Design a protein around this ligand. Structure first.
Ligand code: A1CDQ
Ligand code: A1CDQ
Length: 330
């Protein structure tokens, strides 16, 4: 089998991407944030505290003839930005772009943090990291990809995110029309449960390429590119007036600037992030200070190749027995 679904930016900045997902019988369609950095499929629901729902579409298990309570199971998650959610668990039929999994754990939120309530465009998350990170207790549950894998034509999914435009998530096949050149594959460590890999270096603008190993994760659920402070300083030093602001929480730059590109290495290959992809706009409405799309990872504990980087490539998440990542230009 295969599946193919369109993913759409939630706003004019590409802050996140939403993909429609069918849950239950008859189908209830929710717009989920596909997150290769976590491993829980959770949704706003009829069980969510009413004061914490503000515009989201909810899953109602009592209206699904295929929903079954997973008795005794609970879940609770906190993300890298401090957002969180928790609740109980049902199994139900879940379909993405024509690909159907029966018996998928659908984690129903009883509580969500204010950051989720305040974003009416995201109805929940669909995790695509390794199932060892799933938070369901006392019986850990499998991701949608892990459940689907054996049925897929090939044990892979691909992320093709657009810049200010829709893109695609495919399951079970490589669309050879969706990229240019060849795909370069690189090794993955699953030791922390992430799609963790080692970039071979970077360049700023037209500058020379610096060969240096940068360990990090391919994370579709993170907006920005988070890298070591040395690398990030070298980038922003090429933008007149750019500075790190403690009050704002990162590097800012004059909105009048033209930003240089940023290149990262994948083996001997190179992915070029255009400068425009690094512009996240005024820090507040009407400000002439703009927020940068490359930020320091120093406070996180891991480097994160988030959407800023991934949207510059066609990315293969190869879930074969020895997992690998592939990157191509597009
Ligand atoms: O802050 C934004 C609005 N609600 C939270 C959202 O960011 C996240 C998206 C996915 C995972 C964690 C956080
Ligand atoms: O819904 C609102 C529109 N822009 C802000 C908020 O959502 C998000 C902000 C940051 C990351 C993910 C989502």
């Amino acid at each position: 089998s295969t599946g193919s679904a369109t993913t759409t930016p939630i706003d004019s900045l590409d802050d996140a991407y939403i993909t429609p997902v069918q849950i239950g019988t008859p189908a209830q369609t929710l717009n989920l944030d596909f997150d290769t950095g976590s491993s829980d499929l959770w949704v706003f629901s009829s069980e969510t505290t009413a004061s914490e729902v503000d515009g989201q579409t909810i899953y109602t298990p009592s209206k699904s003839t295929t929903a079954k309570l997973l008795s005794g199971a609970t879940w609770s998650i906190s993300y890298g930005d401090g957002s969180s959610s928790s609740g109980d668990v049902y199994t139900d039929t879940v379909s993405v772009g024509g690909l159907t999994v029966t018996g998928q754990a659908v984690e129903s939120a009883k509580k969500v943090s204010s950051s989720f309530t305040e974003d009416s465009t995201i109805d929940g998350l669909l995790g695509l990291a390794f199932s060892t990170l799933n938070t369901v207790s006392p019986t850990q549950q499998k991701t949608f990809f892990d459940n689907a894998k054996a049925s897929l034509d090939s044990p892979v999914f691909t992320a093709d995110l657009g810049y200010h435009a829709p893109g695609t998530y495919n399951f079970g096949f490589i669309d050879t029309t969706a990229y240019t050149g060849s795909i370069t594959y690189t090794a993955v460590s699953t030791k922390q449960g992430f799609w963790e890999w080692t970039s071979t270096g970077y360049a700023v603008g037209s500058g020379t390429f610096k060969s240096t190993s940068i360990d990090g994760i391919a994370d579709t659920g993170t907006t920005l590119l988070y890298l070591p402070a040395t690398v990030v300083s070298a980038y922003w030093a090429q933008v007149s007036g750019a500075k790190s602001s403690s009050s704002v929480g990162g590097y800012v730059f004059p909105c009048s600037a033209t930003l240089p590109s940023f290149t990262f290495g994948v083996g001997s290959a190179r992915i070029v992030i255009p400068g425009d992809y690094i512009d996240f706009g005024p820090i507040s409405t009407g400000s002439s200070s703009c927020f940068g799309g490359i930020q320091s990872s120093a406070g996180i504990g891991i480097n994160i190749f988030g959407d800023v980087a991934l949207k510059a490539a066609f990315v293969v998440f190869n879930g074969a027995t020895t997992p690998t990542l592939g990157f191509a230009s597009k």
